Amino acid sequence: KSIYEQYLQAKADNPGKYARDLATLMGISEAELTHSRVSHDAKRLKGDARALLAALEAVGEVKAITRNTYAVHEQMGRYENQHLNGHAGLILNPRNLDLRLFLNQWASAFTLTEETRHGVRHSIQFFDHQGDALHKVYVTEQTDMPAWEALLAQFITTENPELQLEPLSATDEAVDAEWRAMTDVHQFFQLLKRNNLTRQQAFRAVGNDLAYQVDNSSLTQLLNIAQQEQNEIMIFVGNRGCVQIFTGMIEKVTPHQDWINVFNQRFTLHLIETTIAESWITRKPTKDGFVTSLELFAADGTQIAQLYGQRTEGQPEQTQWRDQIARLNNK
Structure with missing residues (x-):
């Protein structure tokens, strides 16, 4: 054959x-x-x-x-709205096709x-x-x-x-301080590399007011609350070479x-909800206030997906999103 x-x-x-x-x-x-x-x-x-x-x-x-x-x-x-180069490129259309590309991975x-x-x-x-x-x-x-x-x-x-x-193919206390001093959500990437950590490592390293675990049923709870309330949220899904971003209502x-x-x-x-091994709430400071996310990990540490409230530069995250996150169970 x-x-x-x-x-x-x-x-x-x-x-x-x-x-x-x-x-x-x-x-x-x-x-x-x-x-x-x-x-x-x-x-x-x-x-x-x-x-x-x-x-x-x-x-x-x-x-x-x-x-x-x-x-x-x-x-x-x-x-549309393409900005391509090898290590990081964009197709930038919030609420429509919104991609982040690592083109050197593309064979x-x-x-x-x-x-x-x-x-x-x-x-x-x-x-x-x-x-x-x-x-x-x-x-x-x-x-x-x-x-x-x-x-x-x-x-x-x-x-x-x-x-x-x-x-x-640094100390806990110093990581916590680095995180608290962040001003852009994108500096988190840098924190990880410069300090040599896995998101799950960094999450454990910092204080529980900055990152804490919630039950694994949290995604479904959250999607349902969002569906009911009709607020705009963001859903990120990635692989080694591409990250695709949804912004809209459920x-x-x-x-x-x-x-x-x-x-x-x-x-x-x-x-695949059954593959969610760890569910983290994180709060990362920015010029526009704390940004709160739900980040999902499989057993092997794979980043399954991340959720955020809708937000554009110079605006805060909506209180509604924070209220919804507060309704999740602490594990």
Whole structure:
């Protein structure tokens, strides 16, 4: 059986599975799975991530998907307001497509056209040096098709070379003082690196008024309170090369088995609630007051997702958000 034939057998034996999870069963990366689908339902793209992302501005509204093993973030939007470079880049559209990119992690790209039950799905899919998915873009009803098709005609190549996979990869009191002296939420990144800590290390290092644990049911409680109250919140989901940010209201929250889901007209969250090992409340000072977040971690320390209240520069977080956080149980 070729890799593609193994895929077809894996798919027949597991018709409920994401391609990601089929790859796992097969003992390969999702990128390698996609590579085997080329000249079947996929094609290789001329890959340069920057060039592809820049070209996507032309296609108008699409659906963007970023995930980690624990959470999937799906958002309607456009690839506008781009500021790309290698270590840190932006696609800056608050409430629509709002991405933070580490482009040096971006290795390969493919397009897929699949007959899928619902219908035909068209997509562009980006993978990292380990072959894991970074980001996927799906055609939707509002997508500018002539531009999508023109883009693909410009980027598809017949050259499908083998993927070049790469292997992986201060005192408590001083950390607490560093944190209290922070003025921008972004300085937290620096605190961690300069002091050599894991978020979970830093959280434990500081005082309980700055960071404390809450029950693992807290996410679902919070999403439901938010759904009821209709206040604007922020939901961050990342992987090694991409962070995708939702800002808006919660329209519907629904569990399904181990999953907790948010179902909005323009945003979908799927999160495996049972994998939440630690749930932290953190309060980081800024020029505009303390910013309060709920940060979720899996057993291995993976950052599942983070939640914040809506906020723009020069404004405080809403009291409403703080009130909602205060309703969570202390563990």
